[PDB]
């Protein structure tokens, strides 16, 4: 089913919200008897020309990816007046990894966190082979399919690299989650697969702190930023990073995983390991742990 008849998408609730977009939980119920499959459905509201263009791109990217570790595209449906599309995807009832880690902390061991690390890395390896920069990778937009299975979601900011170039540049984002971004992204608006590796090291930090709010990247920054408190965060963060300061090793985090983090956060993009180099190292550590 490539086209989902709007009439059969039964609205249930909202799942989540960005500025320009929402995701809704719907049942696709073509028998009309409320027995059909749940789906997540994304649509724009309150968006300009660039946001609409960016959404058709989002759709095309997700539709082309077939990975166990990337949230699955199902189809499209029509929005109001059949003047717009909605992006129909599989529904993962366990929600985002960030919140799952906080709720289930007590029973998720290092081996399970290594499994999630390995799965995310594999997904990113898959993206990388399709010249896709995710950009937004964070625990808050990774989804839990089952207790032993996660998937990368939220392709709102994803972009394909041209055949002939290994990065792109944007106009200064008005607002971005600065504590996940590589320094070249913060300072020169450069994004690449290697800037995704930086963000992945911050994902490893998220995983091995169980996304505890007390040692969040923001909380660590405020601890680290120093005595001068009226200094703009982004300005101060870039200085800290330039000086070689990095998020600290979580108390419980295996030393080898911390070492991977530090490699991910190499100052020079070309000095960071690729996802294909990270994957076997994480796989080895996960294997070790079960």
Ligand X SMILES: NC(=O)Nc1ccccc1
Size of site (CB under 6 A) for ligand X: 11
Q: Does 143 bind ligand RQZ (CB under 6 A)?
A: yes
Q: Does 99 bind ligand RQZ (CB under 6 A)?
A: yes
Nearer to ligand RQZ, 95 or 162 (CB): 95
Binding span for ligand X by CB under 6 A among 54-62, 115-123, 143-151, 242-250: 242-250
Q: Does 197 bind ligand RQZ (CB under 6 A)?
A: no
Nearer to ligand X, 147 or 242 (CB): 242
DSSP the chain: --B--GGGEEEEEEEEE-SSEEEEEEEE-TTSSS-SEEEEEEEE-S--HHHHHHHHHHHHHHHH---TTBPPEEEEEE-GGG-SEEEEEE--TT-BHHHHHHHHGGG--HHHHHHHHHHHHHHHHHHHHTTEE----SGGGEEEEETTEEEE---SS-EEPPTT-SEEE-S--SS--GGGS-HHHHHH-EEEHHHHHHHHHHHHHHHHTTT-GGG-HHHHHHHHS-S--SS-HHHHHHHHHHTT--PPPPTTS-HHHHHHHHHHT-SSGGGSPPHHHHHHHHHHHHHHH-
Smallest separation (angstroms) from ligand X to the CB of 266: 10
Binding flags for ligand X, 153-192, as an x/- string (CB under 6 A):
--------------------------x-------------
Binding flags for ligand X, 188-207, as an x/- string (CB under 6 A):
--------------x-----
Q: Does 40 bind ligand RQZ (CB under 6 A)?
A: yes
Q: Does 236 bind ligand X (CB under 6 A)?
A: no
Find the binding residues for ligand X in span 119-158 (CB under 6 A): none
Q: Which of 128, 217, 269, 279 binds ligand X (CB under 6 A)?
A: 217
Among ligand X, ligand RQZ, none, residue 15 binds (CB under 5-8 Å by kind): ligand RQZ
Q: Which of 86, 98, 135, 159 binds ligand RQZ (CB under 6 A)?
A: 98
């Amino acid at each position: 089913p490539t086209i989902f008849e709007e009439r059969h998408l039964k609205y249930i609730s909202q799942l989540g919200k960005g500025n320009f977009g929402s995701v809704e939980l719907c049942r696709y119920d073509p028998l009309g008897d409320n027995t059909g499959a749940l789906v997540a459905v994304k649509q724009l509201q309150h968006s300009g020309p660039d946001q609409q263009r960016d959404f058709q791109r989002e759709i095309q990217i997700l539709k082309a990816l077939h990975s166990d570790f990337i949230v699955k595209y199902r189809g499209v449906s029509y929005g109001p007046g059949r003047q717009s599309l909605r992006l129909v995807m599989e529904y993962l009832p366990s929600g985002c990894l960030r919140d799952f880690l906080q709720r289930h902390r007590a029973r998720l061991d290092a081996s399970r966190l290594l499994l999630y690390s390995s799965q995310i890395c594999k997904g990113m390896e898959y993206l990388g082979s399709r010249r896709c920069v995710h950009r937004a990778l964070a625990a808050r937009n990774i989804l839990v399919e089952s207790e032993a299975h996660v998937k990368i979601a939220d392709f709102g900011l994803a972009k394909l690299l041209p055949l002939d170039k290994d990065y792109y540049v944007v106009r200064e984002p008005g607002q971005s989650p600065i504590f996940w971004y590589a320094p070249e992204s913060l300072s020169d608006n450069i994004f690449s697969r290697q800037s995704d590796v930086w963000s992945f090291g911050v994902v490893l930090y998220e995983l091995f702190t169980y996304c505890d709010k007390s040692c969040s990247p923001s909380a660590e920054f405020l601890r680290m930023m120093g005595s001068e408190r009226d200094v703009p965060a982004l300005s101060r963060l870039l200085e800290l990073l330039e000086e070689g300061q990095r998020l600290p090793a979580p108390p419980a985090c295996p030393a080898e995983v911390h070492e991977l983090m530090k490699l991910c956060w190499a100052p020079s993009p070309q000095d960071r390991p690729s996802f294909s180099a990270l994957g076997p190292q994480l796989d080895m550590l996960w294997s070790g742990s079960r």
